[PDB]
Structure formats: structure tokens, C-alpha cells
Enzyme design. Structure first.
Site, PDB file in Angstrom:
ATOM      1  N   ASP A  35       0.829  -1.202   0.000  1.00  0.00           N
ATOM      2  CA  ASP A  35       0.000   0.000   0.000  1.00  0.00           C
ATOM      3  C   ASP A  35       0.869   1.260   0.000  1.00  0.00           C
ATOM      4  O   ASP A  35       1.350   1.682   1.043  1.00  0.00           O
ATOM      5  CB  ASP A  35      -0.947  -0.022   1.216  1.00  0.00           C
ATOM      6  CG  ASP A  35      -1.844   1.214   1.298  1.00  0.00           C
ATOM      7  OD1 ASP A  35      -1.871   1.994   0.328  1.00  0.00           O
ATOM      8  OD2 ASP A  35      -2.510   1.403   2.346  1.00  0.00           O
ATOM      9  N   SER A 199      -0.007  15.792 -11.886  1.00  0.00           N
ATOM     10  CA  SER A 199      -0.232  15.453 -13.278  1.00  0.00           C
ATOM     11  C   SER A 199      -0.430  16.728 -14.090  1.00  0.00           C
ATOM     12  O   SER A 199      -0.968  17.709 -13.599  1.00  0.00           O
ATOM     13  CB  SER A 199      -1.439  14.524 -13.407  1.00  0.00           C
ATOM     14  OG  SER A 199      -1.810  14.383 -14.767  1.00  0.00           O
TER      15      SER A 199
END
Length: 330
Positions: A35, A199
């Protein structure tokens, strides 16, 4: 040193991926959920409330000759999905795909949330975010990667998740045969303890790329792609019959519909998520209504590049002094 282990989806939808981890002496093998959105290595154990164990493989510290109680230490965690768990702490030997850490904090669950009990295929989590998020008190503990870093040939691990198929986590090296083209690296902020990056934008299907900054985290521990409501709306608008359903808790669509790809930007580079990756099947058995794999992050408080996005790329988690993230097509 290096390590390499295969990670396998737990079900036909890729809801999560499990990776075998050896704990203790002799080895006890548990299948853990790697994770990158958290920083605790915790396991179902002989200490876990019996009523809360249902099929999971457990860690039994008393059967391990290298286990040592970390005296006074407790841990308690709650996840973004309302899940939680808590217990005490041992140090022990932990190996992942040939790579061994001695003295790793192994957090033994005394209590787990129902959601963990109900998932017989996940025996615990192995956190790979930054150690600053680790919940052990009074002395914060380091992640498996942090402990291994100095020994690794290179201070990196990579995630190469499969679509409806197994994939690979590598530690200490970059497998140049595992991706196409080049790896584009992008800056990371560790200020929230996550692999947080920005992004450069998105496209929907064959649509024109929209240049816009999207701050979010690369999180192997989250199934879906969670993005701002504007973005998500622009995506589902291109799927006939799709709608946001409050009763279901997100965007659904008829499975007779064709899903467009979704492209996200990494610097000047582009990662394409095929439409098929965004289908998470009927909302209930036999329903004609399918759940979407791109959902709004509104009210999560952060955008999450979960498995839906990451499994479309070869991803480098670079733990250099100044961490960075690398993305390649594959």
C-alpha cells in the site's frame, strides 16, 4: 541487494493485489496488500480477536524465534475507506521476494474493522508511503522500504500491476524489459507523507489533451481513480447512459456501453488507461448497471491515482534523498 515478488489480484475485478511476505523464523508466509498510501506493516495474528478472523492466514509471534516484543508500543490506524485496526508490535525478520530486513516492525492486530474480516484473501497491509505516517506510538517505526533502502543496489522500488493478471513489485532495481519507451520522472512532495505529485492534464478517449494541474497521490492501496468532479464529469459525459447515482455512491453505466480510454499527463509524457480498465462490473449480482472505475474525489480531500491508473504504467517510486516518481508505458 534486490528483491522481486509477484503481486496477484484478489478477485476478477482487480479490487486489490496481494503479495507473499515471509515473516519470522521459520518463515510464516502471509499475503499482504502493498500500500503506497500508508506506512504500517500490520498483520492478522494469533492476537486478533477470534470473532474478527475469517479465513485469513495469521502471524504467530510466539512460534518465531526471531520475534521480539517492542515493549510499550501500540498502533491504531483508520483508512480513507472507513476501515481500521489496532494492536501491539513485534520486531522480526521480514523478506519480500529474496530481500530481507531484520528488525522490521510487524504490527500485530488485536482488533480489525469488519471490512478486513470480510476479505479472506488479505492477511494484512505492507505500507510503502513515507515513514512519517507510521502510527506506532510512542516510537514511530520505519517502513520495510525505509529499512531496506541503504542496502538496496538503488534506493527505489517499482510497481508493475497487471490488468486481470499478476504483476510485479521490485526493490532496488529497475527492470528495463518491463516497459516501453522511456521513464518520465516527476517531482514529489512528501509534506503529507504520500507519494504526491502533479499530473499535467488529461484527455478522454481520442479527445484533445486538456492541460491542467492535478495534484494527487500514487496509491497502490486504492482500487479506483479519484479525480476532481469537473474531470470525472467530462469523462462520463462521453459514455451513453452513464449517470452519477447517490444511492450507489458514484458513477454507473450500462455495460452495453463502450468505455473510452482516459489519458493522464506525466510532464510531457502520456499514460493511456484503456477503457476496459474502468469497468468494475455489475453493482449487484445480475444487475445491468455497472460501476465505474473513475470517480469524484470531492470530499476525499485529495486526488488518488489508484490501481486503475497505476496498472496502466510501470511506476518507479524513487526514494533518493529528494524523492521522485517515474512513469512509463508498458
Amino acid at each position: 541487494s534486490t528483491g522481486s515478488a509477484t503481486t496477484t489480484p484478489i478477485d476478477s475485478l482487480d479490487d486489490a493485489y496481494i503479495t507473499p511476505v515471509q515473516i519470522g523464523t521459520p518463515a510464516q508466509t502471509l499475503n499482504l496488500d502493498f500500500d503506497t498510501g500508508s506506512s504500517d506493516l500490520w498483520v492478522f495474528s494469533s492476537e486478533t480477536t477470534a470473532s474478527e478472523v475469517d479465513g485469513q492466514t495469521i502471524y504467530t509471534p510466539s512460534k518465531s524465534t526471531t520475534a521480539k516484543l517492542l515493549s510499550g508500543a501500540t498502533w491504531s490506524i483508520s483508512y480513507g475507506d472507513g476501515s481500521s485496526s489496532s494492536g501491539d508490535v513485534y520486531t522480526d525478520t521480514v523478506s519480500v521476494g529474496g530481500l530481507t530486513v531484520t528488525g522490521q516492525a510487524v504490527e500485530s492486530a488485536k482488533k480489525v474493522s469488519s471490512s478486513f474480516t470480510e476479505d479472506s484473501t488479505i492477511d494484512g497491509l505492507l505500507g510503502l508511503a513515507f515513514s512519517t505516517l507510521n502510527t506506532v506510538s510512542p516510537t514511530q517505526q520505519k517502513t520495510f522500504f525505509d529499512n531496506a533502502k541503504a542496502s538496496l543496489d538503488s534506493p527505489v522500488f517499482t510497481a508493475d500491476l497487471g490488468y486481470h493478471a499478476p504483476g510485479t513489485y521490485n526493490f532496488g532495481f529497475i527492470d528495463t524489459t518491463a516497459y516501453t519507451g522511456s521513464i518520465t520522472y516527476t517531482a514529489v512532495s512528501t509534506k503529507q507523507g504520500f507519494w504526491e505529485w502533479t499530473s499535467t492534464g488529461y484527455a478522454v478517449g481520442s479527445g484533445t489533451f486538456k492541460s491542467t494541474s492535478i495534484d494527487g497521490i500514487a496509491d497502490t492501496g486504492t482500487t479506483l481513480l479519484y479525480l476532481p468532479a469537473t474531470v470525472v464529469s467530462a469523462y462520463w459525459a462521453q459514455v451513453s447512459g452513464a449517470k452519477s447515482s447517490s444511492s450507489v455512491g458514484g458513477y454507473v453505466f450500462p455495460c452495453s456501453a463502450t468505455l473510452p480510454s482516459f489519458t493522464f499527463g506525466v510532464g510531457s509524457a502520456r499514460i493511456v488507461i484503456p477503457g476496459d480498465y474502468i469497468d468494475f462490473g455489475p453493482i449487484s449480482t445480475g444487475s445491468s448497471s455497472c460501476f465505474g472505475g473513475i470517480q469524484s474525489s470531492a470530499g476525499i480531500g485529495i486526488n488518488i491515482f489508484g490501481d486503475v491508473a497505476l496498472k496502466a504504467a510501470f511506476v518507479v517510486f524513487n526514494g533518493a534523498t529528494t524523492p521522485t516518481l517515474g512513469f512509463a508505458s508498458k
